[PDB]
Design a protein around this ligand. Structure first.
Ligand code: GDE
Ligand code: FE
Ligand code: FE
Lengths: 405, 407
C-alpha cells in the first residue's frame, strides 16, 4: 500500500557484462559503478518488499507473440538464455497477489493487459538488477515485472504510458497490505543500436529529458515516436517506460540522485526519486477503488460448481496446466500414453498433481485449479470422449447424465 | 474500406471434430443462411473475432491479440494437425487497424505463425468453401476471455466501435466481413457443467441486434450466471456488433441446442452510417500515422513496424532459436544441415552465411536477433555496430568515448 519512491536506470547488457567480468576496479567502468551507489544504498536501507519492475524484453522471451503491457504474475523468475547461456544468478521471487490486485484495478481502468509466467528475464531486467541488489543467493526483494512492447510499432502513445503509471500508483496504493513498494523504469537513455545511424547519442537531449521527467513530466506527454527517436535514437525512444514509472509517483518528487555516463553506445543514466505522498486525498478512495476493482466478480462466489480461472488459480495451477498443455506436441502426447511414469518422473509436477492426472480425476483437477480446455486436451488425447468428463463432473455417468434433451 | 456486415456463430469444437444425421440437419443449414451471404457478397477479408482455448495462447496470454501474418495453419489441439488448407491473412489491413486502435488508446498484442484452433477453424469449414483454399483473407482478433481479470463488456464494445471506423478508413476500397464468433449459453466445467439458459439466450440475441447498448453493464457475474461461465465469452459478440451500424437488418437467425452448447447464429447486414462520423476518414488516417509521421527523415534508421516484422519473420524466427543451446550448437557445427531443414529462402540463407550485418537490417531482421547471432559466434556487439557504419572496429571504437567490448 506504500510506494516509497522510484528509480530509473539504463538496462544495457554492458552493465551486466562489466559486472560479471568484475571490472568494478577497471578505470573506465569504476566511476560508472559509483553512479549506481546511491540507488543501491537507498534500496538496501528502505528495504522495499517488492519492486514493480518496468523493462522491455529484447526479442528473447517475447517475439512470435508480442504484447504492449505484459504483467508477470508467476511466483518465480530465472535469467533468460540470450544465446550465450543463462547468467549465474538465483531466480527472483514474484508476487502473484500484488500482480493480481494490480491486474484488477488496471482492467477496471480500461487498460488491456497480458499475463505471463514461466518465462525468463533477459538483460532488460537482470542487467541493472544484478548491480542494484545483492544476490549472492537471495534477492532482497520480490518483483512484479511489467514487460513493455516497445520494439514493434505501432506501440502505445507516450501519454498512454504516463496514464498507465497513474492508474498503477493507485492500484499499488490501494493494495490492502502493509508493504513498501519501489518502482523501476529501466532502459534508455539516448542510443541507437541499428542501421548506419548506429552510434547516435545526444547528451543535450538526455539531460533535458531527465530534468523534465523529474520536475515537469506532463510536458513530455505530447512526444511522438518520431520526436523521441530523432532526439534520442530509435531504441532511445524506449524511455517511455521511464514516463510510466514516473506516472506511478507523486506529482512532485525529491530527486535524490542523478548520474550520467556515455562510454560506448549507450548513455548510461540513473535517477533516484523519493516519493512525497499524496497532498490532497485522491478523487477515488482506497476502499472505493478496491470495490470497483472486483466489481466484475462481485457475487461470483455464490455460484457453486464454478471455479473461475483468475490469476491466483492460474498461478496455483501453472505447473499442471503447462504439463497438460504440452499435449499439443506430438512426442509428448505419445509418451503421455507410452510412458506416463517416465513423463511423470522427468516432470516438476508435485506427486499430488501426478495422481490427479493418473486417476483421470476430472472435477478433482477442476477443483485443484486445472483449466478445462487442458482437460479437453487430455480426454481427446487419452481417447476419452469429452462428455465422459462432463458426466464425471456432475457425479453421474455417461448414460444417466446424457438425459437432458 | 466498406464493411458488408457481421455474422455471429458458435465455435463449439464438435461442430467440426466429428462432423467432417436427423438431429444436426436443422442447424447444419441453419448455418447456410449466412453461408449464402458469404458466397454472394464475397468479402475480400473477414475480420474474425474468436478466442483461443488455451492451445496457442497460454504461458503468455493477452486480451486483444491481433494476427498480423500472411498464412494461418490449423492449430494441433492434441487431436493432431487437422487437414485443412492454410488460409491467407491480411498484414496490410492488420497493420492499418493496429494504428487506429493504438491511436484510440487500445493496448494490443501482435502475433504470427501460430495455429488457429477450433475457435476459428471449426466453424469456418462450415461457413466457407474450403476446397483448395478459402474465399477470403482473414484478420484474426484472438481475444483473451478465459483468465480474469479480462476487459469489460463496455471495453469489448468500444473496441468494435473503434474497429469499425478503423476498417472504414482503410484507403483500399475492398469489402470486409466481421465475424463475432463465440457462445452461446453453456458451461463446460465444475458441476454446473451442463448449465444452459435460453430465456436469456433469446433475450440476448434480440437485444444484441436491436438494443445492444443495454448490454453494456453486464458484469462477468450477471453474464456467467445467466449463461454459464464459458457462456460469458459472448462479449466477443458485442465487439462484433460494435463494428456495425447502430441500426441493422437481421437477415437470418438460427438456433437449436443439442448437447452442451447453445449453437446460435445471427446474420447482420450493415446499413449506412447514422450521421457522418465526427472525424473524417482522412483525418483518421492522419491521426493513425501521426506517431511515426516523418520518421523517413531519420537516416540510417529502419523502424520495426508490422510490415517489417511480417517481411522479416522467417529469418527473424529462425535467428530467434539461437536462444536454444541445441539449435545454436548445430548452427555453429553443421550450419548447412540446419539451412536445408529450415524454411529460409536462398537469400535469407546467404545473409546469415555471409555474416551480412547491414544487409540483415535492411532486409527486416531486427537488431536483437543479430545481437544473439554475434554472441553465438563468439564475436560481439561492437563488430556489428562497426559493420553497420562500414568502419573497421578500431576506427569505430574511435567514435566512442571509451573502448569496451561485450556480448
Ligand atoms: O550495446 C549497447 O550498449 C546496448 C545493447 C542493447 O541490446 C540494449 O538494449 C541497450 O540498451 C544497449
Ligand atoms: Fe531495451
Ligand atoms: Fe470459447
Amino acid at each position: 500500500a506504500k510506494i516509497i519512491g522510484g528509480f530509473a536506470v539504463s538496462h544495457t547488457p554492458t552493465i551486466a557484462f562489466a559486472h560479471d567480468a568484475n571490472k568494478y576496479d577497471d578505470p573506465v567502468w569504476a566511476p560508472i559503478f559509483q553512479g549506481f551507489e546511491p540507488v543501491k544504498q537507498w534500496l538496501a536501507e528502505q528495504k522495499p518488499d517488492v519492486t514493480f519492475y518496468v523493462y522491455n524484453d529484447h526479442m528473447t522471451s517475447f517475439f512470435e507473440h508480442y504484447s504492449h503491457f505484459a504483467l508477470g504474475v508467476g511466483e518465480e523468475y530465472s535469467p533468460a538464455d540470450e544465446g550465450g547461456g543463462q547468467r549465474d544468478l538465483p531466480p527472483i521471487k514474484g508476487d502473484p497477489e500484488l500482480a493480481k490486485h494490480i491486474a484488477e484495478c488496471l482492467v477496471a481502468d480500461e487498460f488491456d493487459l497480458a499475463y505471463w509466467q514461466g518465462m525468463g528475464l533477459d538483460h532488460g531486467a537482470f542487467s541493472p538488477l544484478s548491480v542494484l541488489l545483492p544476490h549472492e543467493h537471495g534477492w532482497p526483494c520480490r518483483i512484479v515485472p511489467l514487460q513493455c512492447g516497445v520494439l514493434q510499432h505501432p506501440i502505445p502513445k507516450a501519454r498512454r504510458f504516463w496514464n498507465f503509471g497513474r492508474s498503477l500508483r493507485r492500484a499499488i496504493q490501494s493494495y490492502p497490505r502493509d508493504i513498501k513498494v519501489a518502482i523501476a523504469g529501466t532502459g534508455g537513455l539516448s542510443h541507437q543500436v541499428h542501421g548506419e545511424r548506429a552510434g547516435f547519442n545526444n547528451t543535450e537531449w538526455d539531460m533535458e529529458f531527465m530534468e523534465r521527467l523529474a520536475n515537469d513530466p506532463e510536458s513530455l506527454l505530447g512526444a511522438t515516436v518520431t520526436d523521441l527517436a530523432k532526439k534520442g535514437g530509435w531504441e532511445g525512444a524506449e524511455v517511455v517506460m521511464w514516463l510510466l514509472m514516473r506516472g506511478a509517483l507523486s506529482p512532485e518528487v525529491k530527486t535524490l540522485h542523478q548520474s550520467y555516463f556515455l562510454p560506448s553506445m549507450t548513455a548510461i543514466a540513473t535517477m533516484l526519486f523519493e516519493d512525497q505522498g499524496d497532498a490532497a486525498p485522491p478523487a477515488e478512495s482506497d476502499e472505493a477503488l478496491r470495490a470497483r476493482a472486483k466489481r466484475e466478480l462481485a457475487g461470483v462466489e455464490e455460484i457453486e460448481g464454478t471455479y473461475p480461472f483468475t490469476i491466483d488459480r492460474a498461478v496455483k495451477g501453472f505447473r499442471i496446466n503447462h504439463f497438460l498443455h504440452r499435449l499439443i506436441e506430438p512426442d509428448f502426447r505419445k509418451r503421455f500414453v507410452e510412458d506416463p511414469e517416465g513423463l511423470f518422473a522427468e516432470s516438476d509436477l508435485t506427486e499430488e498433481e501426478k495422481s490427479l492426472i493418473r486417476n483421470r480425476d476430472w472435477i478433482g483437477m477442476i477443483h485443484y485449479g486445472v483449466i478445462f480446455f487442458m482437460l479437453e486436451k487430455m480426454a481427446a488425447v487419452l481417447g476419452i470422449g469429452n462428455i465422459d468428463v462432463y458426466a464425471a463432473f456432475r457425479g453421474l455417468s455417461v448414460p444417466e447424465f446424457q438425459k437432458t434433451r
